UniProtKB/Swiss-Prot annotation, chains A, B:
Function: Self-assembles to form an icosahedral capsid with a T=16 symmetry, about 200 nm in diameter, and consisting of 150 hexons and 12 pentons (total of 162 capsomers). Hexons form the edges and faces of the capsid and are each composed of six MCP molecules. In contrast, one penton is found at each of the 12 vertices. Eleven of the pentons are MCP pentamers, while the last vertex is occupied by the portal complex.
Family indicated by similarity: Belongs to the herpesviridae major capsid protein family.
Coiled-coil positions: none
Subunit structure: Homomultimer. Makes the hexons and eleven out of twelve pentons. Interacts with triplex proteins 1/TRX1 and 2/TRX2; adjacent capsomers are linked together in groups of three by triplexes, heterotrimeric complexes composed of one molecule of TRX1 and two molecules of TRX2. Interacts with scaffold protein; this interaction allows efficient MCP transport to the host nucleus. Interacts with capsid vertex component 2/CVC2. Interacts with the small capsomere-interacting protein/SCP.
Protein source organism: Epstein-Barr virus (strain B95-8)
Protein name, entry field: Major capsid protein
Superkingdom in the source lineage: Viruses
Annotated compartments: Virion; Host nucleus
């Protein structure tokens, strides 16, 4: 336990799970929404999937 | 053609084509019958199979 003639600096990164807030003003972003589309995958004997 | 000192027993199986009679009583089973339905399977360079 003798000190050599050179000192050190240590560096280590740590990770946090954090819970945030988000403010957004009124009427800030504008959206344009379309009508959706259907399409049927071919017939499976017991069920049909759209 | 001298007898070796041991005999042998030979086993064969044989197949017979035959006609048959099947008797089934009255109302022995219940058949439930669903509607027939169609779906495409391939499309080759020339034709389409269903």
């Amino acid at each position: 336990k003798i000190h050599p003639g050179v000192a050190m600096t240590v560096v280590r990164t740590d990770e946090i799970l954090s819970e945030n807030i988000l403010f957004s003003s009124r009427a800030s972003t504008s959206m344009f929404i379309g009508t959706p589309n259907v399409s049927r995958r071919e017939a499976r004997v017991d069920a049909v999937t759209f």
